[PDB]
Design an enzyme around this catalytic site. Structure first.
Site, mmCIF file in Angstrom:
data_model
loop_
_atom_site.group_PDB
_atom_site.id
_atom_site.type_symbol
_atom_site.label_atom_id
_atom_site.label_comp_id
_atom_site.label_asym_id
_atom_site.label_seq_id
_atom_site.Cartn_x
_atom_site.Cartn_y
_atom_site.Cartn_z
ATOM 1 N N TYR A 108 0.758 -1.249 0.000
ATOM 2 C CA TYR A 108 0.000 0.000 0.000
ATOM 3 C C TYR A 108 0.783 1.292 0.000
ATOM 4 O O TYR A 108 0.189 2.355 -0.164
ATOM 5 C CB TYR A 108 -0.877 0.088 1.176
ATOM 6 N N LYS A 123 1.601 -14.517 5.367
ATOM 7 C CA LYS A 123 1.909 -15.557 4.398
ATOM 8 C C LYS A 123 3.443 -15.691 4.419
ATOM 9 O O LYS A 123 4.155 -15.682 3.420
ATOM 10 C CB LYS A 123 1.360 -15.114 3.042
ATOM 11 N N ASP A 143 -3.836 -18.022 4.066
ATOM 12 C CA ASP A 143 -4.868 -18.725 3.318
ATOM 13 C C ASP A 143 -5.602 -19.754 4.167
ATOM 14 O O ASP A 143 -6.806 -19.977 4.033
ATOM 15 C CB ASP A 143 -4.231 -19.387 2.097
ATOM 16 N N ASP A 202 -6.974 -5.983 4.924
ATOM 17 C CA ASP A 202 -7.993 -5.533 3.977
ATOM 18 C C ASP A 202 -8.912 -6.666 3.545
ATOM 19 O O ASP A 202 -10.132 -6.518 3.527
ATOM 20 C CB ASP A 202 -7.331 -4.926 2.739
HETATM 21 MG MG MG Z 1 -3.229 -22.505 -0.688
HETATM 22 MG MG MG Z 2 -11.519 -2.953 2.373
#
Ligand code: MG
Ligand code: MG
EC number: 1.1.1.42
Lengths: 414, 414
Positions: B158, B228, B281, B305
């Site tokens: 961002y 991640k 994830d 987000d």
């Molecule tokens: Mg995956």
């Molecule tokens: Mg948003």
């Protein structure tokens, strides 16, 4: 060198885009670590049973074990997590299937799965998620989900171009950025890790072309490009634009009423495919609130990673979700879950993900009948509530089955 | 210069970490574009009614309109989307609230909301999501969700450090990467957009410190770092590590049984807070399948987000979700939805997000009683099924109300 290439059996051939599959193909498989030891045996048994049933003995698969991950250090030596011959063999024999892999920590070894994908340039991560009637779901209407995820597999932040905080290299690229590129947007340039997100025109057009072609060949209703392009203009924003441009330029996309969405006419059924886009955080709401609105999904590497997991959880399928990594010269089908070492050897986990990736493998080979017997098998076994522990926990009136026994249950419902 | 600073009314003071709030504070508000014209009036009316009710006339807010977005081009001129005096006024008057903003396309103007956040270094994006009994939800058990999202707001992708494909600048940084840094991992260096993801030690420790302190002050059960980090080692992986290190070093975190999770003892209730982490994830599955396991969530900018939108959709609250952007010197509370221009002026959309961001604003000011009357108001109105069109569509037996009328309905249930 340690792989025993099968006596009977014939290699699949790639005769200019077309797969030339013999009646006895050699298919390489990577067993996988952890529960790979449980689920891969169950899959070889139902795939064999499905090709036996459909072609009444005429066709047979010669399975060939190849190695990667932890079992590879036991076969080739402590240092070899990914043997170079695995990379040659998948490429040569053309299609292969794998169970879950363990990547070590503390040795500077990046994801062994991302290495296979990138080294073999298996640029399409195809993930179909649809509801199987009767599997327990956390949402009220999981049957409204029938989506196909085309996740780009060769670029994005997954390329692995990054530098450690306080490292000399990190200091050097932060120096280049501030001094030669004049960036003032780094809040804290000290003790700062840096990562590089690439996105190219060839990279996204080959993925989007594969997605729109899939829509025509299976006459799907729409292709949705999801992106966070408003904040990431030149990577994610460029992905959305290059994808609309490919629909215009190669498929004859025309504006649906003032745009931005396009219509592609399916050259075979005459129906119109809607090419649309939705911003990635809004899409994560939309798949839950309006899942009937979406069908084939095209997106970048990290967003497809999140989208496919989020979507597999809502149809109750985090343990039965299939996957494929497809390139122009080969394909690697796979179990999409982890190694789960605590359960390894216990014959208790769901063999459903690797079995449904095997139906995807057969369908790829053109052995459609065999492939249809497996989803018949699956629908039958789940519907019979003759299921494995992870589903049985959430069902009333179910019979608890072992991993192997659920393999037999699929063959029983074929 | 075009803002009329109120005759009666006194500025809030920041007396070394502590907010010194007068009985008549001047609070700046940005109306917002589109439906801002509908929802902001409804919010000023219920906030006024709540402080009138609780302090029986002793306290009053002097509201002061400031400008950003499309209404700003109408007040200051076509070219000014974000006046510099808005930035001074929020900083000076200390707390402010805003409706939705329009950022234009075609002018090279990046998100006006991200500009406010970064310019005022409002580094904490706090997003509480919990279920309000009776709002329609897509999931079976939405009441199991009561999470608080601490999303880092000053770094990550961002920051806006990127270059266009085929631009001279993109060619130059790809040249530096390949030639001077020796990167061979870019699949297609031609026609390639490049983006920079930064993550620093100060950046993540100030966010994680704010999150663990929130857990002690409201004695929450756990703080979960989602990342991640397996694929992004030196940014996301560094975030998880720096967050565990801050729990150890500043809060006396101790290993829960061999690690990696930590236990922080709440110095006030004696209970132990579990500091854990989950890959991003997998977390997107876990919030759907096991939402009772999670509580305060700490994460980077893009993942927060996605997490906060995904989470607001499952409790049926994409239109009643509150938000705050908090820094050390000021705070900007906000409606978290868009401008929805098609409905603007129709008095039909849900004023619930900006009203619940106003309860967050009052609670921040220490006007707890006023703040508690608004969530009482809200619970009452929703439970009465006396609701606005977006909820009524999904309810049987509901009475349809306008935006304004639902404002009155909240005051009625106070
Ligand atoms: Mg995956
Ligand atoms: Mg948003």
């Amino acid at each position: 060198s340690k792989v025993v290439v099968p006596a009977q059996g014939k290699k699949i051939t790639l005769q200019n885009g077309k797969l030339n599959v013999p009646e006895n193909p050699i298919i390489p498989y990577i067993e996988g670590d952890g529960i790979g030891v449980d689920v891969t045996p169950a899959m070889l048994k139902v795939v064999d049973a499905a090709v036996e049933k459909a072609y009444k003995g005429e066709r047979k698969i010669s399975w060939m074990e190849i190695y990667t991950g932890e079992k590879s250090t036991q076969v080739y030596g402590q240092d070899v997590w990914l043997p170079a011959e695995t990379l040659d063999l998948i490429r040569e024999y053309r299609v292969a299937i794998k169970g879950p892999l363990t990547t070590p920590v503390g040795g500077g070894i990046r994801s062994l799965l991302v290495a296979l994908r990138q080294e073999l340039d298996l640029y399409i991560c195809l993930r179909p998620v649809r509801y199987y009637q009767g599997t327990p779901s956390p949402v009220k209407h999981p049957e409204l989900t029938d989506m196909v995820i085309f996740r780009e597999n060769s670029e994005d932040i997954y390329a692995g171009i990054e530098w450690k905080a306080d490292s000399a290299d990190a200091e050097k690229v932060i120096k280049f950025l501030r001094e030669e590129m004049g960036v003032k947007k780094i809040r804290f340039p000290d003790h700062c890790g840096i990562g590089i997100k690439p996105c190219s025109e060839e990279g996204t057009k080959r993925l989007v072309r594969a997605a729109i072609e899939y829509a025509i060949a299976n006459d799907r209703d729409s292709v949705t490009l999801v992106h966070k392009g408003n904040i990431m203009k030149f990577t994610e924003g460029a992905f959305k634009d290059w994808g609309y441009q490919l629909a215009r330029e190669e498929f004859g996309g025309e504006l649906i009423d003032g745009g931005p969405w396009l219509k592609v006419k399916n050259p075979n059924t005459g129906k119109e495919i809607v090419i649309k886009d939705v911003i990635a955080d809004a899409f994560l709401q939309q798949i839950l609130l309006r899942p009937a609105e979406y069908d084939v999904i095209a997106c970048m590497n990290l967003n497809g990673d999140y989208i496919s997991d989020a979507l597999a959880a809502q149809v109750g399928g985090i343990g039965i979700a299939p996957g494929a990594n497809i390139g122009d010269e080969c394909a690697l089908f796979e179990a999409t879950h982890g190694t789960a070492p605590k359960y390894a050897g216990q014959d208790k986990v769901n063999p459903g993900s690797i079995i449904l990736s095997a139906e995807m493998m057969l369908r790829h080979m053109g052995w459609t009948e065999a492939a249809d017997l497996i989803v018949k098998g699956m629908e039958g076994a789940i519907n019979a509530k003759t299921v494995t522990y992870d589903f049985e926990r959430l069902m009333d009136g179910a019979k608890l089955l072992k991993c192997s026994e659920f393999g037999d249950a699929i063959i029983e419902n074929m």
